[PDB]
Design an enzyme around this catalytic site. Structure first.
Site, PDB file in Angstrom:
ATOM      1  CE  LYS A  86      -4.363  -1.816   1.738  1.00  0.00           C
ATOM      2  NZ  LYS A  86      -4.352  -3.208   2.254  1.00  0.00           N
ATOM      3  CD  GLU A 108     -10.469   4.094   1.483  1.00  0.00           C
ATOM      4  OE1 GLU A 108     -10.298   5.307   1.228  1.00  0.00           O
ATOM      5  OE2 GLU A 108      -9.902   3.167   0.844  1.00  0.00           O
ATOM      6  CB  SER A 376       0.208  -8.163  -0.956  1.00  0.00           C
ATOM      7  OG  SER A 376      -0.547  -9.029  -0.119  1.00  0.00           O
TER       8      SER A 376
HETATM    9  C1  LIG Z   1      -5.061  -4.326   2.150  1.00  0.00           C
HETATM   10  C2  LIG Z   1      -4.227  -5.461   1.737  1.00  0.00           C
HETATM   11  C3  LIG Z   1      -4.532  -6.281   0.634  1.00  0.00           C
HETATM   12  C4  LIG Z   1      -5.802  -6.172  -0.160  1.00  0.00           C
HETATM   13  O1  LIG Z   1      -5.915  -4.943  -0.922  1.00  0.00           O
HETATM   14  P1  LIG Z   1      -5.687  -4.912  -2.486  1.00  0.00           P
HETATM   15  O2  LIG Z   1      -6.094  -3.489  -2.871  1.00  0.00           O
HETATM   16  O3  LIG Z   1      -6.582  -5.954  -3.107  1.00  0.00           O
HETATM   17  O4  LIG Z   1      -4.222  -5.165  -2.756  1.00  0.00           O
HETATM   18  C5  LIG Z   1      -3.678  -7.304   0.333  1.00  0.00           C
HETATM   19  N1  LIG Z   1      -2.543  -7.541   1.017  1.00  0.00           N
HETATM   20  C6  LIG Z   1      -2.216  -6.802   2.065  1.00  0.00           C
HETATM   21  C7  LIG Z   1      -0.959  -7.136   2.802  1.00  0.00           C
HETATM   22  C8  LIG Z   1      -3.040  -5.723   2.454  1.00  0.00           C
HETATM   23  O5  LIG Z   1      -2.669  -4.979   3.517  1.00  0.00           O
END
Ligand SMILES: *Cc1c(COP(=O)(O)O)cnc(C)c1O
Ligand SMILES: O=P(O)(O)OCCNS(=O)(=O)c1ccc(OC(F)(F)F)cc1
Ligand SMILES: [Cl-]
Ligand SMILES: [Cl-]
Ligand SMILES: [Cl-]
Ligand SMILES: [Cl-]
Ligand SMILES: [Cl-]
Ligand SMILES: [Cl-]
Ligand SMILES: [Cs+]
Ligand SMILES: [Cs+]
Ligand SMILES: [Cs+]
Ligand SMILES: [Cs+]
Lengths: 393, 268
Positions: A86, A108, A376
């Site tokens: 993010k 948000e 992610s």
């Molecule tokens: C918030 C989050 C996501 C999901 O959000 P996307 O917009 O679909 O990427 C995925 N992985 C992590 C580690 C997150 O914090």
């Protein structure tokens, strides 16, 4: 009238009150201008490199795949400053806010990661940050709430509706409808009204760009597939974007299956919801038969967005990308497997992507396949969730 | 039908403005909501704006957020709202009835089918709050096919292109926003921009009703004096419901008193 196409096939659009249309047009113009501005690009690249820590590693995971013909790499967004992907797009959006002359940020958040990312970018870049968070989420995410407050953001509980992410999304837009002259709405995923799905993709696309360079360096060829979890769609579209025109590369998005699709307790609207219009866009969403918006359920707090980015719905419709689901139990097993076999604690969100990769391998262990999973985020935040589940086992 | 056209012609004949209350259908329950609405009419409402409870009313401030929540607590569904609307029309043949909708409730079961149901129950207009003129085509087309006026919003800072679009595409009335932000009596808007009212007339737009933050007779009077055909008040009405939940009788008395006063302000 817009500079760019607000739709991906039938999906997307700008379904906001009339009052907000100038704000969206202003943002689109600023974005198009920024994308052509080498100075903006250099400032963004500088923050990504020297503040956030890009490029992130691409890690070959040999232990997990031993005895099969799968080669698995993990793209290490877990190593980015803040612990998740993010951070990439909030730095970009913060720079757009500054470009437009705005000094205030609205964001948000559901589980809190986007709030933390927004707060850290705002602290760095001298912006006043206010974050809306459903009161139920505030209650259950005290660590992230405290992080946001430590970084000087105002966290505002939202008590309306279900007091969760969708309700925070609404409140952010209500605020923006009155404050857009001074504040930028830093939306947290590749969804919402145009131009946000486009902006968020472009400010996450370094994930896939780097992955492509790294895999070419190591393996001398493109991946057979890249696999990413799908909450709202930002990390997945960031991984996919630079491969869309490489038609040999599979794009696999993994939605949360929760307790199982058949239970109805899931968060997989792209494949198991119904197209609706909400949060500024036409997209598949979690909704009642009557058209009331519902929550997404997953063991992973971060896959709680009750719709999906319109570009994902489009890539699915044309067959360019495939979307699957992974249950809580499958994600938990992938989490434990990575910890034990690779010494990496993955976010429960990311564990959905890993779980699907593990399935691809285990189902067909003699299939030669080069896979990349987008990791992610890191899973430090999830260790007690996983503890409390395995304590009841 | 031509209910708004007929109303405006009659009001014009009397040098009179329209006073138009908003309430949420089924707040605080179906039976009480029906009595509320009959009271608004008896006290002098010229037309109605009626909200169908929606999970995510992102153009509404707290007062109306809470109205939606009260209706849901009473188990109010869109189907029940359409039943209410049919009965309201059966009791009151000439009063214009406008719905305040969010897009998902219109799109859910099909846009055409939504507007056909509106026609069946005798609704006159639909304002879809989260559909800007830019996205309006399928909504306004379905509206007109079913003899429903699609209502469009003219913001304070509307440029010429938007004024021309709102003038061309809308019917029934033009919604003149008093300010940016969301619904609420706590936030007063501006005097109708005379420039906007004049341009709308130049472009043969539907007559303007000013709305957002109208909570007092003085504001109704001012709207009409500025050249608007009338004024809409929602939060101020809904607050009376909220305040008097424990006393249905006092609720109706206060609603009657308030509406009477607001309507009086519209008279020549
Ligand atoms: C918030 C989050 C996501 C999901 O959000 P996307 O917009 O679909 O990427 C995925 N992985 C992590 C580690 C997150 O914090
Ligand atoms: O008196 P207030 O401040 O409560 O305002 C009353 C508003 N009720 S309404 O149905 O006219 C109405 C009209 C438009 C709305 O949003 C939009 F402009 F985006 F379309 C929302 C409600
Ligand atoms: Cl093995
Ligand atoms: Cl509910
Ligand atoms: Cl389905
Ligand atoms: Cl397959
Ligand atoms: Cl034209
Ligand atoms: Cl009073
Ligand atoms: Cs292997
Ligand atoms: Cs492939
Ligand atoms: Cs999803
Ligand atoms: Cs008057």
């Amino acid at each position: 009238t817009t500079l760019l196409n607000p739709y991906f096939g039938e999906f997307g659009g700008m379904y906001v009150p009339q009052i907000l249309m100038p704000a969206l047009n202003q943002l689109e113009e600023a974005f198009v201008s920024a994308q052509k501005d080498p100075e903006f690009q250099a400032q963004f690249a500088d923050l990504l490199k020297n503040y956030a820590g890009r490029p992130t590693a691409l890690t070959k995971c040999q232990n997990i795949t031993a005895g099969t013909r799968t080669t698995l790499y993990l793209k290490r967004e877990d190593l980015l400053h803040g612990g998740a992907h993010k951070t990439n797009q909030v730095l970009g959006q913060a720079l757009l806010a500054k470009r437009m002359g705005k000094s205030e940020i609205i964001a948000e958040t559901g589980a809190g990661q986007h709030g933390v990312a927004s707060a850290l970018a705002s602290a760095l870049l001298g912006l006043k940050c206010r974050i809306y968070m459903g009161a139920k989420d505030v209650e259950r995410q005290s660590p992230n709430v405290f992080r946001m407050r430590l970084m000087g953001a105002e966290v505002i509980p939202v008590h309306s509706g279900s007091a969760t992410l969708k309700d925070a999304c609404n409140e952010a837009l209500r605020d923006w409808s009155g404050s857009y002259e001074t504040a930028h709405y830093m939306l947290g995923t590749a969804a919402g009204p145009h131009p946000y799905p486009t902006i968020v993709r472009e400010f996450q696309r370094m994930i896939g760009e780097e992955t492509k360079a790294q895999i070419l360096d190591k393996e001398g060829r493109l991946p057979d597939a890249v696999i990413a979890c799908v909450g709202g769609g930002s990390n997945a579209i960031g991984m996919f974007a630079d491969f869309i025109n490489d038609t040999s590369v599979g794009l696999i998005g993994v939605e949360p299956g929760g307790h199982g699709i058949e239970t109805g307790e899931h968060g997989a609207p792209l494949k198991h919801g119904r197209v609706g219009i909400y949060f500024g866009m036409k997209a598949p969403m979690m909704q009642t038969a009557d058209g009331q918006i519902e929550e997404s359920y997953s063991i992973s707090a971060g896959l709680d967005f009750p719709s999906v980015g319109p570009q994902h719905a489009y890539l699915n419709s044309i067959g360019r990308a495939d979307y699957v689901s992974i249950t809580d139990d499958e994600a938990l097993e992938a989490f434990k497997t990575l910890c034990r076999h690779e010494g990496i604690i993955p976010a429960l969100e990311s564990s959905h992507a890993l779980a699907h990769a593990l399935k691809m391998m285990r189902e067909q262990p003699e299939k030669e396949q080069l896979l990349v999973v987008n990791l992610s985020g890191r899973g430090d935040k999830d260790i007690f969730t996983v503890h409390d589940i395995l304590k009841a086992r | 039908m031509e209910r708004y056209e007929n109303l405006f012609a009659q009001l014009n004949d009397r040098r009179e403005g329209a006073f138009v209350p908003f309430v949420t259908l089924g707040d605080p329950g179906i039976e009480q909501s029906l009595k509320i609405i009959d009271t608004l009419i008896d006290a002098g409402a010229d037309a109605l704006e009626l909200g169908v409870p929606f999970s995510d009313p992102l153009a509404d401030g707290p007062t109306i957020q809470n109205a939606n929540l009260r209706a849901f607590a009473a188990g109010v569904t869109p189907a029940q709202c359409f039943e209410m609307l049919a009965l309201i029309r059966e009791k009151h043949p000439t009063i214009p009835i406008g719905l305040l909708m969010y897009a998902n409730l219109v799109f859910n079961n099909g846009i055409d089918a939504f507007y056909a149901r509106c026609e069946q129950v005798g609704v006159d207009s639909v304002l879809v709050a989260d559909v800007p003129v830019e996205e309006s085509a399928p909504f306004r087309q379905a509206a007109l096919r079913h003899n429903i006026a699609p209502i469009f919003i003219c913001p304070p800072n509307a440029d010429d292109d938007l004024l021309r679009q709102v003038a061309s595409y809308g019917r029934g009335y033009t919604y003149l926003l008093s300010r940016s932000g969301v619904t609420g009596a706590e936030n007063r808007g501006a005097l109708p921009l005379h420039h906007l009212i004049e341009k709308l007339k130049e472009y043969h737009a539907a007559p303007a009703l000013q709305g957002f933050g109208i909570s007092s007779p003085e504001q109704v009077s001012a709207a009409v004096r500025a050249g608007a055909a009338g004024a809409i008040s929602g939060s101020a009405i809904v607050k009376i419901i909220e305040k008097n939940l424990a006393s249905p009788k006092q609720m109706l008395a206060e609603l009657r008193s308030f509406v009477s006063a607001m309507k009086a302000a519209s008279r020549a």
